[PDB]
Amino acid sequence: ANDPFTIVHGNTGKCIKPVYGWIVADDCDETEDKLWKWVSQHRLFHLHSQKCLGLDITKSVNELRMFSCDSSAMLWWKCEHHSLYGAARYRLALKDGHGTAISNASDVWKKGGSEESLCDQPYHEIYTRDGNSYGRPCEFPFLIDGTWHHDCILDEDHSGPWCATTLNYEYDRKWGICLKPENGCEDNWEKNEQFGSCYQFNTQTALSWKEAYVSCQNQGADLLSINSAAELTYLKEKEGIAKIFWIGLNQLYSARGWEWSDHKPLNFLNWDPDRPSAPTIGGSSCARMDAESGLWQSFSCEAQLPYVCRKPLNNTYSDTRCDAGWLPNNGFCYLLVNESNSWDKAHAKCKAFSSDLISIHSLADVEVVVTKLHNEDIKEEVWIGLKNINIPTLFQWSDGTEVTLTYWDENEPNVPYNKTPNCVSYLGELGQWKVQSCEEKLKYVCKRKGEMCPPDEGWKRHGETCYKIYEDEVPFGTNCNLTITSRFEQEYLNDLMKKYDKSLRKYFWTGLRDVDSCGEYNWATRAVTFSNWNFLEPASPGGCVAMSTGKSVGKWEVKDCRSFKALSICKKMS
């Protein structure tokens, strides 16, 4: 994974370590010989001795001692609440300052310095470039000449830090250069001042789209997003990089519809008509680039391809007067024309209203047009300001305001090939957006100007209510019991969690709980009218319900109220 730590007994506060390969408790000193990291396959590596903690279960010996890490003893360890279990769920325990392994043991284990359980951080992989491994990640530990290395190696023999990528280096001799995170754009990166960002071109690599996402995320970067024709033309003419590589455009981690993994708006598009927005092969939810044609193809997320990372650099009201009929919101006014008409015609009517066609800049906005202006004919599309006239595509607002939010529906934005202008409408329960033929006579909306949540306390604005993410993973109820009242609040909660945890691994609490083990899930305090259960959920009774990001962003899953920890999202101002 990542960093060394010390293993601290709960009842004595003493740090375990091995002497002559046996586990004894000791007074935490500040040296090396009390340090452990996780290694691959769920092993605890004691750094000083180059041995892995293990448990011999042949016969009933249950001998708890150190082994070579390639040993065939039971070297795997998993956390259960606070205790650490291995084979058959024997738990790591202390007897008389001596390490044992016994059933239903009560001992408590926590990493010193901090006080989290031993499995609270997850195993970070480290991907490579170059070498002879086509990007495959390091296998820790690896063995060269009696020494078991737990991290990358600096040698005069290799360009920079390096690691073996199989479980048997001396035989397979398969290795690569470590892709670790950085500060400047040196040696591992490429400055490009025109775009304000550095580029990493992992040219001879074979990663799935998810492996690729993780390797840029670990480096403190993102998968490439292409935001402009200049950006696109740069990448097309670049020399010496892959002909086909992953980009961050994806329909996997979104609530629905295509998005940039880095959350930059999707307004510049360059779809290959052969593998477009609606994928030919059904279920292809990632997108690659063809640096020869310059086009973007939807593709199976599991294909092993090359990929490109990118990161930036860094620098050195209450209500609103509207004319009657119009709806006030922020400092703007909205009016929904029922008289269906085409796009250019609809634009012209809004100009004749001394307004323009609505530009939408927040889920808050989306919510007000869907729940306030209109509520019945959800099945009819409604025109929105957003339109392209270029090749490659570049949706823009009719009022020249910047494109911040692009709220595409599933398989949108579907641009036709070589066929401008391209207009955008909204339909469905959520106000989601699709591309449309500019002649369709739809209703439309005109937007015209009209007339405490401290940002230090941690608060973020979404209409009237304010939200806040408590940064520490904690048991249920600790900070609040959050009630999710509608599909719109869920949609805004997804944007929050997606923006907070680029790692895809944390969970966030809901207030929903089954207090008795009978089956009713109700908000720990409102009536559960809006549901958002994930597949095959609620799994079981007596639980506490959390959500995450990733494939199922925001979908509810029932956790064990006793052991499960998750971040707190809380709200006030009603």
Residue numbers in the entry: 32 to 347, 356 to 490, 500 to 573, 579 to 627
How is this structure described in the published paper?
pmcDEC205 (CD205 or Ly75) is an endocytic receptor highly expressed on the dendritic cells with antigen-presenting function and has been widely used as a receptor target in immune therapies. MR family members are type I transmembrane proteins with a large extracellular portion, a transmembrane helix, and a short cytoplasmic region. Their ectodomains contain an N-terminal cysteine-rich domain (CysR), a fibronectin type II domain (FnII), and eight (ten for DEC205) C-type lectin-like domains (CTLDs). The functional studies of DEC205 show that it can act as a receptor for dead cells and may recognize dead cells through cellular keratins in a pH-dependent manner, as acidification usually occurs during the event of apoptosis, but the mechanism of the interaction between DEC205 and keratins remains unclear.
To investigate the structure of the CysR∼CTLD3 (residues M1- S627) fragment, we expressed the fragment in insect cells and the purified protein was applied for crystallization screening. X-ray diffraction data were collected and showed two crystal forms, one in space group C2 and the other in space group P1. The CysR∼CTLD2 region of DEC205 has an L-shaped conformation that is also found in the crystal structures of MR and Endo180 and the C-shaped conformation of the CysR∼CTLD3 fragment of DEC205 is similar to that of MR at acidic condition. The structure of the FnII domain of DEC205 is also similar to that of MR and Endo180, consisting of two β-sheets and two conserved disulfide bonds. Loop 1 (residue E521-C528) replaces a conserved α-helix in the conventional CTLDs, and loop 2 (residue T573-A592) becomes much longer and partially missing in the crystal structure.
